[PDB]
Amino acid sequence: LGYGSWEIDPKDLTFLKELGTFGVVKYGKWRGQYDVAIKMIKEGSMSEDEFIEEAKVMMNLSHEKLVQLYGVCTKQRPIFIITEYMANGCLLNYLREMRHRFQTQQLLEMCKDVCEAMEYLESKQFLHRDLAARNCLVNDQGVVKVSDFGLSRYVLDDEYTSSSKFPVRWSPPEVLMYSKFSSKSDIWAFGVLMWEIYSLGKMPYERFTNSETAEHIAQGLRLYRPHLASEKVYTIMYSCWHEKADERPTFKILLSNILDVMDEES
Ligand SMILES: *C(=N)N1CCC[C@@H](c2cnc(Oc3ccc(Oc4ccccc4)cc3)c(C(N)=O)c2)C1
């Protein structure tokens, strides 16, 4: 009583460990048994009513490679967003841990995991809008999942919203010049993410400012081949960066290309 299907009763949460500091993220349990992460939204950081309405839509998105939304806690402030627990944290930090000594087949599987999530979203006409390694999460089996999908829409802090904390390094020319978002801006960002994976978490355009990156990209220049990427892998990531948005592949085509490489570099 008093809760929609999208609504979690905060009294059903057991908090166990802070994971990091939108605000704080904690690890805990739901109804004693189910591991969860609980993102606590800072007062004033988000358009909450719009987010709540979107959450209803988001609860119906379901795919193995998309972090599963369990629901939202709306009746008090700060509001909470509750997901499955991803024990190995952010993809970006995971990549940067040199101890893993990743084989390129593992890096390719990470790309494939994300590509599968993104093909699903594309099939639902849902844009991510801020695809990057910092946003992807890794579970205890090393499976990568897409997280924070669409979330940028409800952030109120203007520095994130338009072209000084905007994702310049993951944005195609039409976004940086004209604010033209589309499926093909997610495709661009995916290619940059493949670059992040194959670079073991280097910052894209690591010696440039955002300002310089925007100018580089606008002039037609691109990220170059990470040393761990084969010529075929680099071909895939590069195809995501065509100057013409409609010459960029779809996520279905990218998935087929990644599967082909996996098979050939098996
Ligand atoms: C990366 N270095 N970090 C710090 C360590 C904790 C990491 C983290 C952050 N969030 C979650 O869970 C999560 C993610 C996204 C949420 O909101 C959301 C989800 C889907 C669409 C829109 C918005 C809510 C919670 C985890 C986790 N799941 O373990 C870990 C981040």
CATH number of the domain enclosing 212: 1.10.510.10
- With a 6 Å cutoff on the Cβ, whether 69 touches ligand 1 is yes
Same domain, 57 and 163: no
Distances in whole angstroms, Cα of residue 236 to Cα of each of 110, 142, 183, 229: 14, 23, 17, 10
Surface-to-core class of residue 156, CB atoms within 10 Å of its CB (0-12 exposed, 13-18 middle, 19+ buried)? exposed
Residue identifier of the C-alpha nearest atom 7 of ligand 1:
89
- With a 6 Å cutoff on the Cβ, whether 126 touches ligand 1 is no
Same domain, 37 and 77: yes
Same domain, 233 and 246: yes
Alpha carbon distance 13, 34 (integer Å): 9
Same domain, 239 and 213: yes
Domain end point (choices 36, 68, 84): 84
Between the CA of 84 and the centroid of ligand 1 the distance, in Å, is 9
Distances in whole angstroms, Cα of residue 184 to Cα of each of 133, 233, 242: 18, 19, 10
Report residue 226: phi and psi, to 5°.
-65, 145
User: To test the ligand 1 pocket, which listed residue (17, 36, 45, 86) has its Cβ within 8 A of the most ligand atoms?
Assistant: 86
Residue identifier of the C-alpha nearest atom 20 of ligand 1:
148
Q: Give a yes or no: residue 200 inside a domain.
A: yes
Q: Give a yes or no: residue 4 inside a domain.
A: no
User: To test the ligand 1 pocket, which listed residue (6, 24, 25) has its Cβ within 8 A of the most ligand atoms?
Assistant: 25
Alpha carbon distance 155, 244 (integer Å): 29
Experimental method: X-ray
Q: Are 95 and 200 in contact (CB under 8 A)?
A: yes
- For ligand 1, what atom is nearest to the CA of residue 150? 22
Q: Give a yes or no: residue 40 inside a domain.
A: yes
Alpha carbon distance 129, 93 (integer Å): 21
Half-sphere exposure for 28 (CA within 13 Å, toward CB): 21
Alpha carbon distance 102, 32 (integer Å): 35
Same domain, 68 and 132: no
Confirm or deny that 83 is annotated as ligand binding: yes
Q: Give a yes or no: residue 60 inside a domain.
A: yes
| Angstrom resolution of this structure | 1.5
User: Domain containing 34 — which CATH number?
Assistant: 3.30.200.20
Surface-to-core class of residue 138, CB atoms within 10 Å of its CB (0-12 exposed, 13-18 middle, 19+ buried)? buried
Domain that holds residue 74: 10-84
| Residues with catalytic function | 130
- With a 6 Å cutoff on the Cβ, whether 93 touches ligand 1 is yes
Closest CA to 203 of 91, 89, 92, 88: 92
Residue identifier of the C-alpha nearest atom 3 of ligand 1:
90
Tokens (6 digits) for 169: 């390094």
Confirm or deny that 22 is annotated as ligand binding: yes
Confirm or deny that 89 is annotated as ligand binding: no
Verify cis geometry, omega within 30 degrees of 0, for the bond prior to 78: yes
Distances in whole angstroms, Cα of residue 49 to Cα of each of 72, 154, 155, 222, 237: 12, 9, 12, 39, 37
Domain end point (choices 40, 56, 84): 84
Q: Give a yes or no: residue 3 inside a domain.
A: no
Confirm or deny that 235 is annotated as ligand binding: no
Same domain, 111 and 67: no
Same domain, 194 and 247: yes
